[PDB]
Amino acid sequence: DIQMTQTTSSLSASLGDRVTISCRASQDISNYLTWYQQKPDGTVKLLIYYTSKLHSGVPSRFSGSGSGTDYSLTISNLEQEDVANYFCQQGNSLPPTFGGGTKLEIKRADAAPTVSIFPPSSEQLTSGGASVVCFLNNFYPKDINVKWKIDGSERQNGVLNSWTDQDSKDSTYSMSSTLTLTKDEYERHNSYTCEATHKTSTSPIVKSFNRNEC
């Protein structure tokens, strides 16, 4: 199969801006390239086929160009309804193959994460497990790193993170970081810390608690 790459998985822009999505093929596909739009809906729509030919019903602010291996999709005046995932396909050789896609995000002013930490409930310990949950809500940009500290030492085992897509209402991101261990292990440590690194702060934002209080 011919392989299709989209090096930029996510692209930042503003409403009214000129946006360019990139696509690459592992060899010459002779302008047999087609572009699609996947909205949050999960719905897919054809936009452009054969490098630059508009599909019926597609707005004119969409256009395409390219040759050989490199191709691109352009949006002259970005609207909120154009915020979606855009991916390409080569139609030169069977089987058809697609790129990983480029998701559009909207630009906004740097916003610091609101960090909140929660000791496990007493109800949860009766199960045998112990989940220490940490929320990091409404921050921008998406770039962020989360570290769990226990009694001073870093910890990686048992940590599962989860991210939301960009919220359209305020153009921010949110993420949950959950540390899960046994009740026996949880009861054998004191200080549990959830510290976040982000552009808005030189020093990491630290949220912690001592088990021996409550």
Partner: protein, 221 residues
């Protein structure tokens, strides 16, 4: 308006076989090539095969040959795909789509279905455990709701029966040893709770579960 409509989510154990459908409308079914695709979170979009409902002429990706059987019923304008001996890799969202070009197709796919989710798992239908997340002592305060060890998806979380929409974050589920887990946060001012009741409502349709965990501050001293 050309429109494809695929069938609902499918749960299956490894070793089973399943069959998903795709009903077309707004055009002559017999006159366009239909294609099937597989979207798995690690891979790009992968091509399965294609069938021409006119004479049921078909072509398959060599990797899905013997894995996926394709059929088309002219009577009801419905395409089908059969998947045999399911394994964990068969877990994905499968799309049916129409190929551009009357009779002889083209090099693109001009109309798409919404997709069908196939979940391969041996896990049994399990209700969620729901745990209140209270603070541990600003204008605002954030509370939480931990939803743990349920199967299958989806779960639905609301706050005060939905009367709290603004300031709510519910995160995608994650898989830990065959069961799903997620958390939901809610930010209210510091005015209305310890004083007024805040309650998360977790619903799990598959198990017919409805639980209401009232958020109450931690018991210490």
């Amino acid at each position: 308006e050309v429109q494809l409509q695929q069938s609902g989510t499918v749960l299956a154990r490894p070793g089973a076989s399943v069959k998903m459908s795709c009903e077309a409308s707004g055009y002559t079914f017999t006159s366009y090539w239909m294609h099937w695709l597989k979207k798995r979170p690690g891979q790009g979009l992968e091509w399965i095969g294609t069938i021409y409902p006119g004479n049921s002429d078909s072509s398959y990706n060599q990797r899905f040959k013997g894995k996926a059987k394709l059929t088309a019923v002219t009577s009801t304008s419905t395409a089908y795909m059969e998947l045999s001996s399911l394994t964990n890799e068969d877990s994905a969202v499968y799309y049916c789509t129409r190929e551009r070009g009357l009779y002889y197709g083209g090099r693109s796919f001009d109309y798409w279905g919404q997709g069908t989710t196939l979940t391969v798992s041996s896990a049994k239908t399990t209700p969620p455990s729901v745990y209140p997340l209270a603070p541990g002592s600003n204008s605002m305060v954030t509370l939480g709701c931990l939803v743990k060890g349920y199967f299958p998806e989806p779960v639905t979380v609301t706050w005060n029966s939905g009367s709290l929409s603004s300031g709510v974050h519910t995160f995608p589920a994650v898989l830990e040893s065959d069961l799903y887990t997620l958390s939901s946060s809610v930010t209210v001012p510091s005015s209305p709770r310890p004083s007024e009741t805040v309650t998360c409502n977790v619903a799990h349709p598959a198990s017919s579960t409805k639980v209401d965990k009232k958020i109450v501050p931690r018991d210490c001293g």
